[model samples]
Target: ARTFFVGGNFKLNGSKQSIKEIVERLNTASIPENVEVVICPPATYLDYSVSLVKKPQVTVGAQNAYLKASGAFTGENSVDQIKDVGAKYVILGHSERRSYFHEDDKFIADKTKFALGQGVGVILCIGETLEEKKAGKTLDVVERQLNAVLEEVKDFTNVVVAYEPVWAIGTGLAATPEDAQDIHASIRKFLASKLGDKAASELRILYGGSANGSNAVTFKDKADVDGFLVGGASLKPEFVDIINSRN
Candidate 1:
């Protein structure tokens, strides 16, 4: 069985003082040894967050990192750069990046390969839009997203697939645990078809979008719902409860 994973995506939020409190709380919390927790803050605070966390299991990741190690690409942080700041992972293809920044699947896949190839892990986000889901293309959309990454990245060792429906993120419209599990299982099945059964079984899949401490326990019975990619709640004290939800 895969280890339970919980990722806190701070998104476009956090300040020096505010982020310090968040990190301090994590440093003080009673996170279980079995759970794998990753907190991703804005790129600006990557090194800062890395410096504050005392727990080994609670790792730090970047919200985004460019594929190139060093380039004249203005305003973009590279994989080498983020890793230099002690970031162990990178969050690529978040719906915000997909929608707000127009990061297509191929770009996300290439960026993922670049980071993983450099020995950094990747938390890859994939899901369908409300319009696509309404048309029964949910599986198709996610499969297509995964296919792009599958074509470029052969090693599934450092990748975690998080299924976050577009409509639910930041909207408080979290997918039902049953519905989330269904998509996650489909995602695993599709991965098995490409990456084979053994790797598929070991891969961790997360449920993102409006996940909070109060509702996190509800997903415990869903086998494929391995963990969560928490958004807003990650900044609050309740994030501690979500970290211990599996307990």
Candidate 2:
């Protein structure tokens, strides 16, 4: 079976001191053996974040990375730079990146390939908007996003897919455990059709949408959902509970 993976995307919200305390708590928290935990802090804090996580079980990740290995992209961080700071995983194609920065599928796919080339794994985010779901095009939208990366990467060994519906994320709304399962199952099916059984079955698909200690266990019990890409709850003390949801 694919391992259960939980990734906390802290976004751009947190002071240096606050982040340090969260990291300290996570390092001291009891991490479940079955769960592989990772935390993605903002790019600026990569060095500090990696240094603060004293536990070997938990690893740090970057919130974003540029498509090119090195370039004139002044404000963007590259995969090389992120990896240089000891980040083993990088969160790419997040909804915030795609929405606020206008990153297209092609650019996201290119960045995925670039990161993998530098030996850094990726947490790839994909989801549909509320309007698309209302239009009954959820699967269609997911397929398009998945196809873009699959076209370029052609490998799933170092990739994790986090399905975070744009409408539900941090909106006090979330896909019910059953709903999350259905979509995750569909994602596995799509991967099988495109990348073959071996690759598809081994892929770790996670849920990310208002996930917290209260709802985490329900989703953890689902067959398709591997774990979560948590938001607000990840920075709170309850995050340890969310990480240990399966227990």
Candidate 3:
């Protein structure tokens, strides 16, 4: 069976002091032995966060990284630099990156491929907006996004796909476990069609958006919901609760 994987996307939040506290809490928590916990702190704190994580089960990741190993891209961070800082994973194709930074499917795909090439894992985010959902295009939108990466990368062993509806993110509105399961099953079916049965079966599909300690356990019975890509709740002590939800 696939391992339960949970990732904390710190986003553009957190201060040095707060980050230290969060790490300290995680270090002392009794996280599950079977769960794989990855914390994606901001690029600036990648090294610091990695340093503070005392648990071997909890690893550090980067919120984003550039496609190039090294380049003249003024404000971009390369995959090598992120990996050098002890970050084993990187989040790509996030909704905010697509909306605010104007990252297209092709760009996100390029980044995913490059990051994997550099021996770094990826948590690739893909989902629909409320508009698209209302229009009944949720699966359509997600498939298109997935296809972009599928075309660029032949292997997906190092990638964990996160499904975070643009509308539910940080809105205090999360998709119900049943709702997430339905979509996650469809995504797995789509992956099976593209990548064959084994890859599709083993790939970890995470439900994101407003996932927190309260609702995290609701997904425990969901077969396709291998774990979560948490947002706002990741900063608090309850994040440990979310990590132990299966217990």
Candidate 1 residue lDDT tens string, 1-247: 7999999999899998998999899888888889999999999999999999898789999999898888789999887878898989999999988998999999999999999999899999998888787899988899899999988999989999898889665455657888888889999998999999999999999998678889988888898888999999999999999989888
- Report the error of model 1 at residue 58, Å: 0.9
Provide the overall lDDT of each model, using Cα atoms, as 2-decimal numbers. 0.90, 0.88, 0.92
Candidate of highest lDDT = 3
Candidate 3 wrong stretches, greater than 4 Å: 169-174
lDDT of 2 at 127: 94
lDDT per residue, candidate 3, 1-247, as tens digits? 9999999999999988999999999989998888999998888888899889899889988988888998689988888998888889999999999999999999999999999999999999998988888899998999999999988998999999999878675556657889999999999999999999999999999997678999899899999999999998999999999999999
Instruction: Kindly report which residue stretches of model 1 are placed more than 4 angstroms away from their true locations once superposed.
Output: 169-174
lDDT of 2 by residue, 140-189 (tens): 99999999998898988999999988867555665788999999999999
Which residue pairs come into collision in candidate 1? none
Candidate 2 regions exceeding 4 Å error are 169-173
What residue pairs clash in candidate 2, if any at all? Answer: none
Q: How accurate is candidate 1 locally (lDDT)?
A: 0.90
